[PDB]
Design a protein around this ligand. Structure first.
Ligand SMILES: NC(=O)c1ccc[n+]([C@@H]2O[C@H](COP(=O)([O-])OP(=O)(O)OC[C@H]3O[C@@H](n4cnc5c(N)ncnc54)[C@H](O)[C@@H]3O)[C@@H](O)[C@H]2O)c1
Ligand SMILES: NC(=O)c1ccc[n+]([C@@H]2O[C@H](COP(=O)([O-])OP(=O)(O)OC[C@H]3O[C@@H](n4cnc5c(N)ncnc54)[C@H](O)[C@@H]3O)[C@@H](O)[C@H]2O)c1
Lengths: 487, 488, 488, 489
């Protein structure tokens, strides 16, 4: 049966004081036991990282970046096993898993260029005969905390950049799918990373708290839900240390009268239902301006939604897999019930998927909910399942007001052919990542990802250029040589 | 008795519910009453900023920067009266005042280049036919909270950049010397700034708290002591808004054997005793390696210290002025008494300056303390007065270990001629701003200021490039155009 | 009669061996005499620049920039007199002159931020204990050669940025309108510029060749006609010095069926006929896709064009002024005769403007030619007058293919509401500066200006960021300190 | 005896109208025949390039960069073979070839970061509701011309970055050692590059002139001698296309009194005599300020120089190999006589190395010349062999004036402990690449390489960030949307 441990100073260790089930959400069956680290075990991770830091701090960027060059190859060689371990515990089918991995590898690609990214600014004669320049030096031991829905990519947002910027890392990944995460961390030792520089510590709140209250932990990167994001951000900030905490979302798309409805519907299938809707960039609300477009959207969407296939990752050619836990399934079903009960139209019901087939695991089918209103709880709250909701509004400004009024502002999209409507949208909308005929406007590895309003806490975003600034601290040197005796 | 009010939506207003004395620290007499804003008056300032934002947000960076161009010249034209105002309330003498104002003008100069500074990064074909780019858009209403020691410069670290980045501003300056701060903000209207974009709200902890608890304030720049910085950071973070908070200092200089001890000592005078040592980059400890240098340092320093002139800003030619308040004066004297009692040699004693001369105001003369050790309370804490302490150590590493071990890590200096020592020092030392033969390694306006350890809270430092990233927020747009119907 | 001199080492001088007439192109009369400098007078200017360079090179960028801060104030203060001078010798009316002046000041504004722009790249630990960094240091004596159509702005593309980058400058402006150019360079001394850093040397081919062949001149920025641009580039390259040479143009605008015609027509008026079309960014060809839009553009263009006013710069409210010379006026009349001969439809005739009114000067009225084809010589060659030609094509791609085929590739535009078409245009079109519903897509001072294909020779464009790189040379230092004796 | 061809559109081809010997310079024997491409053959390569360009231009930077990522691997995988192909024709021993190869791969590593490097600048509201932004789009077909001394690394200066920037490339390498260079170009197809995007066309002046005069070639990167750099720069500039031509060098090192003499000598061994001195960054002149340091330099340098090993690349552990050709050997010998004839002290003589050992190949031993003066021809001119000259001067400023006076200004070094002297030297010295206690201050792949004065023609330097700018063209877009019809309502 076997137990999943911790990666510390290049070794798998296990504490054996407390454990938890990891499941196979397709079958609903218990897969593996996860050892949950207490504060003592987390402190061994931090000691390891802290002990590794001095030599790695002085390790030239080029040499640190060569680890990520080799790490990239290894990610690619082991792609199928990685995807398999993602699939086994998350449930997502090969092509979502391969997409996640690829974007992860892209973060590693970006980090391979650390010497360019770590260039300071040099200034000649700030005064007469006086020079000055900036350096972005390493923080020390950095902590990372990651959610379940991307057990590979979201870690790769953090440790690749952090490590290559000269820090040492302690990762505390989601307990609901830790194998895929640990698998990639172990690859790193093969890629030539010294022992201690990357550590993986599995657990729950106790592990996270220990990271937040250790003085050696100089920075905390968090990606998960807003309620937790906020806790992590307030707590870290209250102990002095720097922090970036990315929260939840309710991504809206405006479908304009001039949009190509076919292309819009085809893209909204993937965006809304891909990865079972368990995405921070999930396109969960379609705001149809007119109807007109409302009717045509719900019509064509219904049609395309019939071809969707829900089932386990063992079957490639499914479109998406199960939800992560029974609890989560019950929550998603709850939200659909709430929508119907508050007056919404369940155009396509997937509460009772029953599509499987030797599976009482945690499945939810693709669901379409029409005539939803801002006073609906299901609209206000993040469902985080395979659900798409439609609001109908009179004008484009009304849809933008509706978006700006929301708690979250992570991601957003406008479908249109008109250049003016696209600029006015991208300029004025109060969300961090904007798409133009792109329902998942995820920034590429060489840009930074981050929402606005309650979707992000902090002033530096995730991965990309901001991660360089977040995983370093500015030192400014001012130099002068008055004593000209030798010359 | 005149009463000092508030700049809100371009007009001087005053609440009159509660006030507080501003002193002329040279004479010790009460000069002026400062009206202290309550939560209602602060909210009026914020409402004025919120109200001005939408149209300032969309004003082109070029046109915003032209307000700073005219602001530059207004600062220069009114330089004498601004230094008078500083001198009147802080106490600092003309040349210190002008130095501050100059470095403040430089912040303005740098802000004049906003359109360069607000460049986003544009990416062609992130996917096939798909472009993407970044924009650093304005925050909204920004709050700024500044200390007494620099009533002009420190404010100019914040609102010029913040405003020219398309935000509106509510400034909350030190209650101890507000006249100068208010004067510069008033010039801003003459420079062509719309009403409400800049506001200045005077007050104490109550006005600060109003700013931290208002949801319309989206960012809070603080510069002050660590204890308060720590509070402001924690409190802002608990209310969701982003924050930078700068804190206290104990700046050390290593004096190496090879250094020209005359250059060192001449440069330590102004660093230790300039602005009466009331400076976040004041060089307050001189670590001498060997002795050897220890003796020579204390010897020459004493001599150079005898030429020092303490006295009011009405006499130019004084090196420095009084300390800010009586409470502070007493505190500074206390640290000197603490040093004495804990074993330190008081080489030059300025507890009893008596140099003035028709002034029982808040004066403390230059003092020199030798043989200080890490266990002394006056070494551990920030004195923030005209005091220089000397510590003696065997090797340069012992000096560096001693610095790294200190609570603060704002600023440091090494005096030497050798290149190896300077790099080893500048690479490894755990402080934010490093000088090689520069006792005040204060970054220029086109760099950013900020300490390490407990001298700063946050990940974006003050003024220059970081201030651009702190007063704006990142939006990434990804663009794609599916149907080519109009083409064909 | 009045003789115009040279500015060499901070003083007006004159050679008086040889001269040329400067006209008032409104009246056709000879206004002043321009002293033409010889290879020996040129060499005096270079000598003055070379002599001023060593101390100017080591002058802090902040101090260099402060000159431009003062220069900006002065150019604004003297704005009326500068526009009057431009108007008197070029002919352009107040508003076009101010427009020129404004854009020139924008270059100056960008120059004021030199310390940022001159930032190198520092790299920590390129190997163990080895650091390296780049410095963009000054060139030395730089030469500038400018055309007639912008006797203020194009010079302000060059010397503001060049001087602030630590160089000294020798300017050789167009001999058709030198007063305005010399006037603004005289303001530079009053701004605090040392003598010799900036110099103006008036002349002809002789003065140019003199600059090209002197080994002390280290970089040449030329802006003018292709044929001369080519010669300058070839000649400077042959002598071993670096060079940027901007040449001619024939800017097209695609008018798609989904375009707002009222808006396109209204902006084409100023783009085609502004500054009497004597503009490197002048939009001289409107390519209508379909007709449909052809018919509609010509219809609305015809109507708006009836309200145009041609005349002398003494009457403001004139839309544009005369052409630069009698020769050039004959040339332009020729380009319009051709178009009618070779078959085109002269929809609005301005050949015989006869609009003035006490002026047998060099006036051409706004003209509109319709049904022009690629074979017509008047389509192939740059007219450089107030003439707008309309070519009709079947599809957008035909338009783009037509544009890409042309010799030049300076500037271009597409009028459309559709984003797909805009990106596909902006992405694939083979021209440097592309506008979307902007028939004059002139980059602002914080960008750079430069065309593709035959419109430009070199690899770094004018003003903006490319100019920092053109006016400085890369140095890379690599630093190591093998011995740690003193530290230990 | 095999015939070396050309890589055109992903295939080996050979014209067979004219050929030339490539030697093994250790033995002095003709190894291989190099096919020389004529203007018709070059034009095929340019046509392959131009044909492949449109799709390659529109390929995303990410996808283009992944070719360089895969290429990174192949180069390291075939590292021994590449080093053998360099040793076989240039003559340089394993470690110098590996050194060369490693710096080249470094240039590949940098190119992998294309997406970051190709970021333009975006500006919001340059006027009211008007945005503008820059783009650095590809040139088209780009031509590269490289020297004999670095047949691997110098080509990696050019085509990795050029290709990843959206261009197609035609490479004309040195005819003296072409096998390594073709070998590395052929690994590029396996790394997933589309046919035609990279081309190698071997030849002499005729192939060079074909590239310069063909209108489809939009940019030319030349690395080589000053005379030819000047020719290439002039010619290119006459035919409208942009160019960067890097040239010769006379690299001086100022040995100050306070310098660590043991460290300087030890570092000056590799810098003077490494790769048999046949290096643009070869430190050929030591300027001893005082003597004092003159005497102590020559003393210690003579001693350490006794342990040098000259021989064939077959014996690893040799410090350096032969010179490239018999003609070049005679030239190098020549300059040493010339120095002796004009009054200079030949402290260590390597004219008659006679160290090999079954080799009448093109061998010159490490030589030291002392008491050289600015008036000597051997000092004015670039020797480009294993020869270290030492000038004596009174003061630091005299050493600096001497350097600035020289024709070349490629690279320089100063040995000192003092910070004031380092800065003053690095600030004021009129050469492009400056070292502080580093005799070979070669910029890393994330920087750019380029001398001053006559060592470089152009304004953008080799590899690094400048290559991004040289291998692209700036486009500025200004955008406005005047009609809000669809947004309303
Ligand atoms: N905005 C973004 O960047 C982004 C991107 C992708 C996913 N997400 C988020 O991921 C979330 C789903 O993943 P999840 O359910 O694992 O997220 P979560 O909110 O539970 O947080 C993830 C991590 O926080 C820890 N955690 C949970 N409860 C805690 C508590 N009470 N105290 C301390 N730590 C605690 C977990 O152990 C886990 O490692 C979604 O709500 C979604 O918003 C956000
Ligand atoms: N970047 C630098 O500064 C640098 C670096 C390394 C080497 N070098 C130089 O490289 C040179 C040695 O190599 P080389 O002898 O092969 O260099 P070279 O100057 O002869 O030129 C090398 C290349 O140019 C071509 N070529 C030669 N003669 C030509 C002519 N007359 N017309 C047109 N093309 C011609 C060759 O075919 C070859 O590809 C040295 O002089 C050295 O200064 C310069």
């Amino acid at each position: 049966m076997t137990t999943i441990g911790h990666l510390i100073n290049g070794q798998l260790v296990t504490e054996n004081t407390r454990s938890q089930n990891v499941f196979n959400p397709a079958t609903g069956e218990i897969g593996k036991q996860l050892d949950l680290a207490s504060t003592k075990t987390v402190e061994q991770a931090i000691s390891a990282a802290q002990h590794a830091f001095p030599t790695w701090r002085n390790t030239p960027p080029l040499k640190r970046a060569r680890v990520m060059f080799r790490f990239k190859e290894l990610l690619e060689q082991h792609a199928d096993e990685i995807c398999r371990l993602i699939g086994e515990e998350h449930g997502k089918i090969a092509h979502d898993a391969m997409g996640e991995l690829q974007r992860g590898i892209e973060n590693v690609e970006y980090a391979c260029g650390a010497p360019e990214l770590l260039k300071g600014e040099h200034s000649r004669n700030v005064g007469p005969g006086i020079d000055s320049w900036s350096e972005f030096q390493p923080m020390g031991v950095v902590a990372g905390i990651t959610p379940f829905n991307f057990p590979v990519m979201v870690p790769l947002w953090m440790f690749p950049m952090a490590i290559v910027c000269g820090n040492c890392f302690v990762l505390k990944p989601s307990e609901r799918d830790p194998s895929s995460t640990l698998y990639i961390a172990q690859l790193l030792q093969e890629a030539g990373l010294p022992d201690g520089v990357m550590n993986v510590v599995n657990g729950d709140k106790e592990a996270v708290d220990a990271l937040l209250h250790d003085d050696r932990v100089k920075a905390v990167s968090f990606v998960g839900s807003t309620p937790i994001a906020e806790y992590i951000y307030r707590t870290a900030s209250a102990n002095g240390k720097r922090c970036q905490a990315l929260g939840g979302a309710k991504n809206h798309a405006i479908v304009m009268p001039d949009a190509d409805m076919d292309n819009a519907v085809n893209q909204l299938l993937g965006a809304a239902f891909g990865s079972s809707g368990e995405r921070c960039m999930a396109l969960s609300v379609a705001v149809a301006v007119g109807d007109a477009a409302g009717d045509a959207l719900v019509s064509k969407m219904t049609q395309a939604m019939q071809k969707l296939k829900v089932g386990p990752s063992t079957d490639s050619g499914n479109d998406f897999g199960p939800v992560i836990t029974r609890q989560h399934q019950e929550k998603v079903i709850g939200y659909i019930n709430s929508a119907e009960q508050q007056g919404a139209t369940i155009v396509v019901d997937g509460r009772q998927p029953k599509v499987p087939n030797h599976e009482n695991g945690f499945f939810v089918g693709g669901t379409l909910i029409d005539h939803v209103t801002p006073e609906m709880t299901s609209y206000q709250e993040e469902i985080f399942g395979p659900v798409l909701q439609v609001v109908r509004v009179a004008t484009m400004q009304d849809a933008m007001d509706l978006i700006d009024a929301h708690e979250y502002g992570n991601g957003t999209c406008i479908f249109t052919r008109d250049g003016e409507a696209a600029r006015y949208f991208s300029d004025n909308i109060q969300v961090g990542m904007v798409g133009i005929n792109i329902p998942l406007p995820v920034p590429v590895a060489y840009h930074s990802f981050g929402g606005w309003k309650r979707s992000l806490f902090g002033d530096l975003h995730a991965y990309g250029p901001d991660a360089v600034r977040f995983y370093t601290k500015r030192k400014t040197v001012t130099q002068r040589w008055p004593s000209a005796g030798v010359r």
